[PDB]
């Protein structure tokens with residue numbers, strides 16, 4: 001009966017097999033615009049692999065379209081306004097990768113502290129004697145500043161405070177101090193104190209008007225020159241030209257970045273030049289386990305809409 | 321009264337200041353052989369920064385020499401036989417870097433699981449789209465095999481089993497099963513079972529005739545092709561040409577290496593070619609905190625010998 005189009009593969013094939021048991025599924029990978037246009041014309045549901053964009057032209061051509069599902073939390077690459085105008089349900093698939101992002105964050109904190117990429121390059125260049133000039137940092141007793149004490153911020157705080165014996169400060173205007181106590185952190189109401197105290201600052205807030213570009217030049221000026229920034233949250237929490245300035249002018253010692261603004265990043269991003277900035281391509285939340293959870297959630301919500309059942313994660317509820 | 325020669329700096333200046341309060345200290349850095357010969361002639365004590373060698377010629381020229389201290393555990397670069405022959409006390413400074421090496425090991429396990437160096441290179445090359453071909457590994461529920469359940473092996477096991485929710489197996493013929501239970505690991509008497517079960521194998525044994533080259537080609541053949549090797553113990557625990565073969569032939573998925581055989585490694589080490597092997601220059605145990613502990617221990621033992629007091633860590637006790 002119903003046809004479904006996957007614009008990009010899911011993060012695990014289980015969701016494709018689930019859809020195929022109930023609908024006629026077509027998958028297109030890294031498609032050109034004309035392939036989207038030809039394949040979307042008669043489908044009832046669409047899945048979009050982040051960060052691929054789904055625009056008003058494609059939505060206008062999709063004469064039978066009832067539901068659009070993203071692959072994870074982010075919907076900024078979907079023209080939601082055009083979908084809402086045509087009564088199309090947009091769902092996302094959030095909150096299914098807490099463990100993945102927590103582990104990734106720990107990996108990046110440790111890689112910066114142990115100067116992993118730099119020391120690796122030195123040894124492979126024949127400069128083992130770099131060990132007379134550079135030492136790793138011991139995490140024990142250092143201060144980690146967490147911005148955003150939500151699901152991931154809490155999980156990172158708990159591991160860093162207990163297993164790694166770090167002092168953990170958390171800034172989050174919307175939680176009680178008891179939430180920080182639970183994970184052996186201290187809630188601080190003054191972001192300036194977190195900035196001046198922290199040896200590592202890791203960003204985990206929801207992206208809002210309040211947190212958009214909250215990490216700008218003024219924030220980097222307050223950080224310790226020896227401190228590192230980690231961002232696995234959203235690219236727009238950081239003002240990218242200001243991070244460039246902060247790295248080049250040595251306002252901070254380095255950064256680890258999994259998220260970008262814009263997404264995908266341009267090929268000539270000015271941050272790539274700096275050996276003390278390390279990158280991953282928005283993969284903090286994409287392990288096989290997290291991908292399977294997100295694939296099942298995306299497939300289930302598509303099937304729900306096609307059967308007239310309300311899905312859990314509607315982004316534009318006024319269409320229902 | 322007494323003069324002391326530092327062949328290389330200590331890992332922290334506190335030990336140099338402690339020595340200078342009681343002796344006349346000279347420091348030479350990355351010295352040529354003739355500088356060692358001229359500076360050692362009349363000193364009562366010598367400190368040697370790893371992995372610098374102190375040979376029979378230098379010891380024979382050191383007419384007043386009473387004590388040699390290494391910087392850490394390893395004494396293989398000292399001609400102990402020549403020192404013992406002249407009645408010279410050799411001390412090492414062991415067991416002061418458990419936390420440093422534990423943290424470093426975690427950093428390397430996580431960096432391999434999250435494909436850190438590879439994904440960083442891809443993004444900086446403009447290949448963010450590598451995220452359609454490569455996914456990180458989620459550590460939760462995977463099996464870590466620890467070889468050697470001593471101070472560092474136990475500390476790594478405890479963090480990986482509790483904080484990271486890994487299944488931990490330990491091989492160590494000289495501990496009771498209760499020691500593994502304490503850190504939420506399982507002791508296994510069959511090394512083959514650890515090899516076939518593990519997704520990550522991390523080496524932490526003492527180097528003995530039994531553990532020398534225990535990780536040879538036969539061992540790599542039993543490991544999972546998807547598994548990784550981590551070595552922060554001693555270079556001689558691994559048969560280096562066999563690790564080269566294992567990496568090139570894809571018997572294992574990668575490795576992280578902090579220790580080398582020989583030390584220092586040659587500039588054209590065949591392992592450097594492989595992007596899935598990451599290196600650090602024998603720095604797992606050298607944070608500022610661990611360096612300060614080792615520097616104080618080295619300075620104290622030198623001063624002890626110069627005052628006729630027996631130091632804790634004599635390597636050649638038959639001279640006392």
Ligand SMILES: NC(=O)c1ccc[n+]([C@@H]2O[C@H](COP(=O)([O-])OP(=O)(O)OC[C@H]3O[C@@H](n4cnc5c(N)ncnc54)[C@H](O)[C@@H]3O)[C@@H](O)[C@H]2O)c1
Pocket residue numbers: 073095097101147148149150151152153171172173174175204205206207208210211232233234258259282283284285286
């Ligand atoms: N890189 C990835 O692949 C990936 C995957 C999942 C989530 N994320 C992102 O990671 C971040 C954390 O995810 P989560 O599941 O823990 O979200 P969450 O909703 O559980 O927690 C977010 C926290 O941000 C806090 N916050 C709101 N305004 C703040 C402010 N002005 N200052 C400080 N904190 C503020 C909220 O009070 C909340 O506690 C989100 O931005 C999420 O979209 C990224």
Ligand SMILES: NC(=O)c1ccc[n+]([C@@H]2O[C@H](COP(=O)([O-])OP(=O)(O)OC[C@H]3O[C@@H](n4cnc5c(N)ncnc54)[C@H](O)[C@@H]3O)[C@@H](O)[C@H]2O)c1
Pocket residue numbers: 393415417421467468469470471472473491492493494495524525526527528530531552553554578579602603604605606
């Ligand atoms: N990379 C560095 O900078 C650095 C720093 C400190 C220590 N190390 C090395 O790390 C390793 C671990 O150090 P540690 O302080 O935990 O030592 P430790 O003496 O506390 O423990 C070593 C363990 O090895 C075990 N062992 C002995 N024979 C074994 C065998 N055949 N198979 C498996 N296990 C066996 C012993 O029973 C013991 O439990 C040592 O080789 C040490 O020299 C490296």
